[PDB]
Amino acid sequence: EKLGKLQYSLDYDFQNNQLLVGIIQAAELPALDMGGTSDPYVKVFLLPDKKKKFETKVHRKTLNPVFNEQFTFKVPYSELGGKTLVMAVYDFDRFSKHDIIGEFKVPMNTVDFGHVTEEWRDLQSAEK
């Protein structure tokens, strides 16, 4: 599978108890709309925990859009250990059955929130 790449910088808050999933943008996104393009928006989801659900701003016909949405990982840092966050990019063609061009996830427990987790995350097309 292949969904391109997504740049992000995730930081942690110990006052309200939430992780700041600050993504930069996604590059080389799959097509969906009639024109080798799509309306990909990242829908931040979580494992069983399911204590968080945010919808990004639809990006009309764009396979390399920038925006940097602020996703608040509603879950105490101490709890993060048992919560695997999942970022799925959903299309918004606005005609056919919006498909999941791709997604990405990482075991928070392995994500040592020392300061800020910044990296060039790889995107994969998870057939859903």
Binding site: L47, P48, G82, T84, K105, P107, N109, T110
Partner: peptide
């Protein structure tokens, strides 16, 4: 690559790369 099958009562099992939590 460091990734283990972490099962959860919920059902959503993922390839968590950790061996600290018994899951």
């Amino acid at each position: 690559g460091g990734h283990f099958l972490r099962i959860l009562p919920d059902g959503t099992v993922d390839g968590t790369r950790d061996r600290s939590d018994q899951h």
